[PDB]
Structure formats: C-alpha cells, structure tokens
C-alpha cells in the first residue's frame, strides 16, 4: 500500500 493513499471513508 506504499503510494496508495487513503481508504474509502
């Protein structure tokens, strides 16, 4: 998950 940013709220 490097670079993959944030998860669905």
């Amino acid at each position: 998950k490097f670079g993959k940013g944030g998860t669905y709220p």
Epitope: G3, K4, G5, G6, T7, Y8
Partner: antibody, heavy 114, light 113 residues
C-alpha cells in the same frame, strides 16, 4: 469531491493530444488517481494510475505511448501515435487505497479521425 | 496477467425479482476481497456500488449486495426496479511486484416490466 476531464477533440491519426483531469475537495498528496477509457459501445478499459508521490504505472498494452503526470490540482494524460483504436471517452477517477474508484468525471471524448 | 470475466450479456430479471452477476478473476485478488462493482447507464459515468467485494458505497440502495472471496465474486440485485437497468462492471487488483488491475467486460441487465 469532484473530478473533471478536459481536452477531448478530433485529432488526426498519428497525432498527439494531452487530456487534463481537474480535481477538487481532496489532495493529490493523499489519494491515488487513475485514467479509464471506453470506446463507443465497448467496456471500461484501465489505462494507468499515478501514486501520491507522482510515480505513474501503465496497463501492459500502453508500451510508453502514454504519459500520466500531475500537479497540485490536476492530472494529465499525454497520448502519442493516436489511431482509431484510441477513439473513446476518457475518464479520470480517484482510486481509494482499498480499490474503490470514486468519484468519476463526466468524461472527455477523443475522436481519432482525418 | 489479471483477467476478469463476467456473466455474458444480457441477463434478465422481472421487476421485483432478483438477478446475480458473476465476476471470475484469473488470479486471487489482493487480500482476497479488493474487488469493486460499478453501475453504468448509457451516456453517464460509472457509479461505484460496492468495494472490498461486499461493502456498499455511501447512498447505494441495500437491494445491492456483493459476495465472494479469492477469485469468484457475485453482485446480486434484490427487488429489481426499472431504475436498475444498466451495465455492471467489476474491477479488481492483485499485487505482482506492483498493482496489476483490470475490469470485467460488463454485464448488461435487462429489466422486464
């Protein structure tokens, strides 16, 4: 949160076009983005994505013909050597870490024609 | 190379009935569940319905449900309405020294009124 594509137009075969995806309501430092296209009457086709650090990755068929880059508020798709196989609606999406693509833009149409 | 294969178009359902669409991955999806479902009506952008195989996105009607893990995924519409007539797409990723992603070919749902 919104994304909006721009730049779609008639382009000559062999030509080059750059599309722009303009975002608002979220940071490109905090979310990944993707380009997806759809040929008329055909399915969604994944093109590539760009990570929060600006590293772009591509579908195996792209073969260096396309470049994805970003700014603070935009992401581009530069496309070279365009043919009729590239005629499509081009969408940008925010791509959540856990895989959901949301939101989508309205799409911009690229018509590769003489 | 990750290939996602969907139930062939078209699939039918009577209004008030139920329809199921399959999405089969050629490889195990990341965490066995990083599979999402999209609704697309003609001339509109896709809409996210479900992510992580079975979690509904904000505002999506509970008549949509997703199930499956690993390689075999199902979207089910319960109490089908005319407003559900659309093309449905799955999208999945696996990690093979980087993210390898694809869409299924889309399943058109024809609603019989």
């Amino acid at each position: 949160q919104t994304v909006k594509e721009s730049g779609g137009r008639l382009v000559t075969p062999g030509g080059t076009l750059t599309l722009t995806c303009t975002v608002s309501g979220f940071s490109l430092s905090r979310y990944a983005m993707s380009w997806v296209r759809q040929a008329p009457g055909e399915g969604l086709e994944y093109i590539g994505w760009i990570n929060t650090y600006g590293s772009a990755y591509y579908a195996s068929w792209v073969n260096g013909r396309f470049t994805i880059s970003k700014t603070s508020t935009t992401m581009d798709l530069k496309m070279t050597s365009l043919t009729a196989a590239d005629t499509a609606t081009y969408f940008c999406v925010r791509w959540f870490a856990d895989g959901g693509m949301d939101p989508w833009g309205p799409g911009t149409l690229v018509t590769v024609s003489s | 190379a990750l290939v996602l294969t969907q139930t062939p178009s078209p699939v039918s359902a009577a209004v008030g009935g139920a329809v199921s669409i399959s999405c089969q991955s050629s490889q195990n999806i990341y965490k066995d569940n990083e599979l999402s479902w999209y609704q697309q009506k003609p001339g509109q952008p896709p809409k996210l319905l479900i992510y992580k195989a079975s979690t509904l996105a904000s505002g999506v009607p509970s008549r949509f449900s997703g199930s499956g893990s690993g390689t075999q995924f199902t979207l089910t519409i319960s109490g089908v309405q005319c407003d559900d007539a659309a093309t449905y797409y799955c999208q999945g990723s696996r990690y093979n020294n980087g993210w390898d992603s694809g869409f299924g070919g889309g399943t058109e749902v024809v609603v019989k009124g």
